[PDB]
């Protein structure tokens, strides 16, 4: 029942140091020196950083250190790198022989260079068109910060439906990716002279166009 | 040294999620906790329970103790999990993880070795294999495969049977209001190699037991 409370999000700049707290109870963090910390990147297994409050496994740099005071534990990360953007979870054994993970803290590393999106737009394949469908695919890559707005146009005019866009997700190079799909019929696709994918990122827009002819 | 989760990636509401954790390079019967932990956006990391290798002692997350079973098969070095009466709230990537420890009543335990995790989607909707379409491709060329309207996740996409890994980028799937997913994988290649190199996306949707190797043509 009782959670280990972490701030959901925390921000600190490159090179700086950050401290992430984890507030537990007298029955876990207060009862044992059994606090551990885990790094979790997108599409990766959670990674043990700290165990028994302040011990590091081999292969975890000394930039990570842990401490506890009363019922609160803390993870400090010094020399913040882009690579450090991830979710960080504390966790502790709990009297009664259960184990509880904190809610996790998403770390954003500030001071990083803006990366404008690479936008690739595909028209429907001829195979899909033979199936009387036309899906336009807008692929958006290598952007940071990971916030975009995707809009579509037909004959230079705003498309109001048929759009489904993904949430930005982290790439292994720490930048973000996203994608957007305009789902039409073949007849609809042929009904306009052109279609556009417009990706807005940090106030600026990259637009790609395809034409049925 | 290694943990490998397996089990049905799609489970219907009210049915039982069952997973197995194949452990390699260490006996399940040794002095370790073997743990099930799940991960979802909505619930972060959640410890589900653990079984202690040396005597079989189990301990469970009190929030779902009422419907969790954990056992081990010393014979084939497997640890298993059953979670029943499952709902969409149990959709998650499920991990097997080893709990190492010193003196537990002083230092608890912690998870040093994890499996890869297995996605389990709890849904009443039917499995659907994807339709795969070429995305035909100026100094560099983007070509790809649209993997359209499948359910559930995941889909894996390699290129040329894995011999092509450089410049490969497989995008997270979109989830449409139809309840169906679409994803795209594209490989960015030198345009000079479009004449010399065949490009095949290898699409694997294990949930529908479907593989598609799609040759990506340069169209006319």
Author numbering:
A (entry chain L): 1 to 6, 8 to 27, 27A, 27B, 27C, 28 to 95, 95A, 96 to 106, ...
B (entry chain H): 2 to 35, 35A, 36 to 52, 52A, 53 to 82, 82A, 82B, 82C, ...
From the paper:
In macaques, vaccine-induced nAbs  had epitopes overlapping that of CH103, bound only open trimers, and neutralized rare tier 2 viruses. The antibody clonal lineage most similar to CH103 we identified was an IGHV4-J, CH505 differential-binding clonal lineage (DH522) with autologous tier 1, and heterologous tier 1 and weak tier 2 neutralization activities derived from memory B cells of RM-5556 immunized with additive CH505 Envs.
DH522 lineage antibodies, DH522.1 and DH522.2, were isolated from blood memory B cells after four and six immunizations, respectively.
